[PDB]
Amino acid sequence: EVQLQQSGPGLVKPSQTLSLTCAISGDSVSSNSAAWNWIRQSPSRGLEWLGRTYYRSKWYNDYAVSVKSRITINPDTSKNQFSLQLNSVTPEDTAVYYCAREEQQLVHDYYYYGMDVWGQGTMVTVSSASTKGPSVFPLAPSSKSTSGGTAALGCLVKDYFPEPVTVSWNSGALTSGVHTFPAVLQSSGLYSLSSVVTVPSSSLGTQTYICNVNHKPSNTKVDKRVEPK
Amino acid sequence: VVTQPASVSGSPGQSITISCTGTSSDIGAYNYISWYQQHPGKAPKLIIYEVSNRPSGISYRFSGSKSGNTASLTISGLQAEDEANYYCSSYAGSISFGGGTKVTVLQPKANPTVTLFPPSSEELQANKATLVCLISDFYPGAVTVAWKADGSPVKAGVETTKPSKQSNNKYAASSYLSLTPEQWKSHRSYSCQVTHEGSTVEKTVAPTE
Amino acid sequence: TNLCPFGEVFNATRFASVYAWNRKRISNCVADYSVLYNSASFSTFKCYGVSPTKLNDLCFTNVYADSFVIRGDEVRQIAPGQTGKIADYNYKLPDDFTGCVIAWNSNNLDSKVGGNYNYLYRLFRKSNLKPFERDISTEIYQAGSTPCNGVEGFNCYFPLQSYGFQPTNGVGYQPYRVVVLSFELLHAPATVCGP
Ligand SMILES: *[C@@H]1O[C@H](CO)[C@@H](O)[C@H](O)[C@H]1NC(C)=O
């Protein structure tokens, strides 16, 4: 299994340089048969190729014309990674950025598969506002949240910036009946989000419930115990 | 620049075909055309390479062809898991993606589950009051949320999300009513009202806690 | 002296691909050359720098028999001063060639329904062969401007090409077994002659 571990989400302030790292494992960054690409995606722009770095005896770079003057991709044989740098960012650079491997088949018949393996993507938001961690409030289960022996309980992840937030329950042990709702953009330009698990109300007295809110952009993690009342 | 239709819909069992059209310098230049499938919040996956090649793991329900300056993808036996974005891409030194096609798998109507949470005593001690109205499991993706206090319609302080695709192709939404702790105490009733097709579903909370 | 093993060459069960042509040194023996000329089995029997008649009245330090398989169309290239894929990349005869070229149709033995892919020829090469050279190299041919790095693929081809001989092909496209006799006279005592 070839896997691409990417560089964690955050905020780049305007006019600064964007910098991301893709770490390969299960393949060599200097592969005969590979190329290491960066691709970004925005809801209004779609998938946008940024460029590639490949090693065929010598090292090589292709870039896309819309970024040719602002971009640098940097392989690292030492660490088995390659990096992306984009200068002089503006809100137009807010996007999810992906690293992908372009793979050619060098055995029997040559095949050109394209982007066969993708990193999970890191969201970069370019904004002049500052990162803010969430405040997490318990949405308590109550006999007024039960419908036939089911209880709904939740965490209100309030007033954070930028995105994203990831929410787990009971450190990832509780996954069935979990519903995490996409965030609302408040008129303050801060985000809020709610996450709920449906659980047997008969387990409220025997099972502890904890939502684990991770906000990588602010190196903050909050675990909030949700008790009934 | 490579054109795809924005949106395609279909019923289970039917067959669908996404057009991908460009120029002699993009799609018709070579036969290095690839198609990708993307579910929301996940990375794209190669499902077709070289116009018609299925990578190992992809069902035969996925077919690919090319004619002239139009490559094209086809999904037979449309299953609910086929709801996703789809993109063609073409190699010519540089790499061009098509603008994307959201593929919907038609489903029967479903009415929403609605859950209303009052403000937590923790948020109230921080001089804040948020009512949270959670709407899930409805189809199609369009709802109307109204809020009322002591029976009277309320517009000040409401923020409601666009519907978003769940993993069962149904839709979720959420709506928040912001108040001060005093207004939360100055009324004896607050309600979230969710309308969808015909149905309306209304839930009420009261500050006696 | 004893007789020369022409059967070992002509009646061999499998012949070589033209790119990997076989040579047999005939020496210290006696051999009749007339029967072959009136063998009633040779589609081609050209001789160069020597007589097709009474050739048996002669002598040579060494005789070389070079066997391989090519198409009927290409037999015309097994002659001095010829050009084509075979003459240029596979088997080259010098301008001053002294010997005979004997060819015959082997469709019954060498072609097969669905193709006989054992018979190969060099389709790509950086330069033309010098007379009597032999390239058994299987190095990847760089057709594009960008280098191959020994990896086959796009613009990077395997040099050898198969014939895929089928019996239904035209007579021009059928396999032909070829034996090229070379008569060598050196400034040393002779070894092969016999009337
Ligand atoms: C080849 O074989 C036939 C019999 O199968 C024989 O009559 C003929 O003399 C042989 N040819 C040579 C060149 O020895």
Residue numbers in the entry:
A (entry chain A): 1 to 229
B (entry chain C): 3 to 211
C (entry chain B): 333 to 527
Paper passage:
The RBD of SARS-CoV-2 spike protein (S) directly contacts the cellular receptor angiotensin-converting enzyme 2 (ACE2). It is the target of the most potent neutralizing antibodies. Here we engineer two bispecific antibodies (bsAbs) using distinct designs and compared them with parental antibodies and their cocktail. X-ray crystallography and cryo-EM reveal distinct binding models for individual cocktail antibodies, and computational simulations suggest higher inter-spike crosslinking potentials by 14-H-06 than 14-crs-06.
Our attempts to use X-ray diffraction to determine a Fab14/RBD crystal structure have not been successful. Therefore, we obtained the structure of free Fab14, and used cryo-EM to obtained the structure of the Fab14/RBD complex. After superposition of the Fab06 and Fab14/RBD complexes, we found that Fab06 and Fab14 recognize and bind on distinct epitopes on the RBD simultaneously. In contrast, Fab14 can only bind RBD in the up confirmation as, in the down conformation, Fab14 would clash with an adjacent RBD domain. Therefore, the two cocktail antibodies have distinct binding models on the RBD in the context of the spike trimers. However, it is possible that the effector functions of 14-H-06 have been compromised against the Beta and Gamma variants because of the reduced binding for the two Fab14 units to the E484K mutation-containing spikes.
